[PDB]
């Protein structure tokens, strides 16, 4: 479809219509365009380790994709996984350069263990993103503190 | 316009961001003397209006399907172009084709007399 763009005017949020032209919406500079990463715990999702694990799975045939966000939410619950296959070989890829853990986490749940790895990459079964430092990825990277959330695109007040 | 349909909503937003002011206390802009990776962020709070924050959470939920399909289409690993693309689309909507001064697709207003 089309990536929705949200307009904020006098503390009122409206979704921009791709067909309707609103001349009142003003964009004086690119600094008014912000991408926000809102964490799933804000939506009240279950944050315990056994319940969050059920939201992630392995699948081959889908290459990983990453987007940037400029602002994130302080997360009370973040996760850091070190899952390995029974034979000992690592099950998650080490994070490439530039990808760092979520900047602000209070409780970091160190998830470890050994299980069968059915695929090449760990994806979010509900469609959300694994939010890292200013980068939103579709894939869980080994040993890096992430916080599952989603991304919005806003045009901010002047 | 948005309306929240999520089960719950946290009406207060405690945020972090680097895209903010740097008072530039002398020699702190220099990376050698600059802050470390953990201290490059600023903070803030938007508890003022409960309704706007709950609307943001639904928008971030609703943009997910279109954003995920966007990433399926592109081939590069990391996509920063999205925000610069939205600005180009913004200008192309208003100033893309011929602009009729009093027309509906032209944001031109004649002077006040």
């Amino acid at each position, epitope marked *: 479809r089309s990536i929705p763009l949200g307009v904020i005017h006098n503390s009122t949020l409206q979704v921009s219509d791709v067909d309707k032209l609103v001349c009142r919406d003003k964009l004086s500079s690119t600094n008014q365009l912000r991408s926000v990463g809102l964490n799933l*715990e804000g939506n009240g999702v279950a944050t315990d380790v056994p319940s969050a694990t059920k939201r992630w799975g392995f699948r081959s045939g889908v290459p990983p994709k990453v987007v940037n966000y400029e602002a994130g939410e302080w997360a*009370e*619950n973040c996760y850091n996984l070190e899952i390995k296959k029974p034979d000992g070989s690592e099950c998650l890829p080490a994070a490439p350069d530039g990808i760092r853990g979520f900047p602000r986490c209070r409780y970091v749940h160190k998830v470890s263990g050994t299980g069968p790895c059915a695929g090449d990459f760990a994806f979010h079964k509900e469609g959300a993103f694994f939010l890292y430092d200013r980068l939103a990825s579709t894939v869980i990277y080994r040993g890096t503190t992430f916080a599952e959330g989603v991304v919005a695109f806003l045009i901010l007040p002047q | 316009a948005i309306v929240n349909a999520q089960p719950k909503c946290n009406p207060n937003l*405690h945020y972090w961001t680097t895209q903010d002011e740097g008072a530039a206390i002398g020699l702190a802009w220099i990376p050698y003397f600059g802050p470390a990776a953990e201290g490059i962020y600023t*903070e803030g*709070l938007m508890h*003022n209006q*409960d309704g706007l924050i709950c609307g943001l959470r639904q928008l971030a939920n609703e943009t997910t399907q279109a954003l995920q399909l966007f990433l399926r289409a592109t081939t590069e690993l990391r996509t920063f172009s999205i925000l610069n693309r939205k600005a180009i689309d913004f200008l192309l909507q208003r100033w893309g084709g011929t602009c009729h001064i009093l027309g509906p697709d032209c944001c031109i207003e004649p002077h006040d007399w």
Partner: antibody
Amino acid sequence: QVQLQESGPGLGKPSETLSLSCTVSGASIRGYFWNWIRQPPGKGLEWIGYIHSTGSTNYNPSLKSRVTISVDTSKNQVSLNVNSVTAADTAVYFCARGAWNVATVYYYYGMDVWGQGTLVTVSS
Amino acid sequence: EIVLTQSPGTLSLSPGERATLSCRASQSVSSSYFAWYQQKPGQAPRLLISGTSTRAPGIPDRFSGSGSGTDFTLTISRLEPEDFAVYFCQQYGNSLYTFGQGTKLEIKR
């Protein structure tokens, strides 16, 4: 094992400024909201106000003029000052942690942790 | 303006019985983050139920919370002697809390 502890003078001279101090232990003040509740002896609870660790504050509509809440992250304390103190302000004063969720437990902005309460009698 | 009126004011009934405590909102809640508190003598109030229906950790299954937008209700089923306290309803909304009059509950014997 987070514990709150209010501190305040047992007697406050009338028409003066009254100061109480809440001291959080076993948990960092950063990232939570912190309330001030007062309870006149033998009556219901009244919410004085709340304050975030960053500093943004909103107070009770009926008391916003005579009150001012403040936080000090270096001391891990939240302070409360009431000015123009009369005899009605005689009460036990609580501080409470009204948080959206802590760790895996959701509290939905319900106040989970309270202080022990400090009684303040206002008399000449 | 946002005032929470609690009923009944006082109440006394025997162990085993069911106590139903009500609390009406003056204006409709714009954020249903309702809560119920139990205050033992000389103690700070304890959190029984938050978010209209979710029990706080360590609160027995007897305490159950429910609501309908304007009227919210707490039911203490199968009453035991330890439930002697005063119970307050609470409403967080638009960056402010409000409490209720309180319901003083006596356990007969």
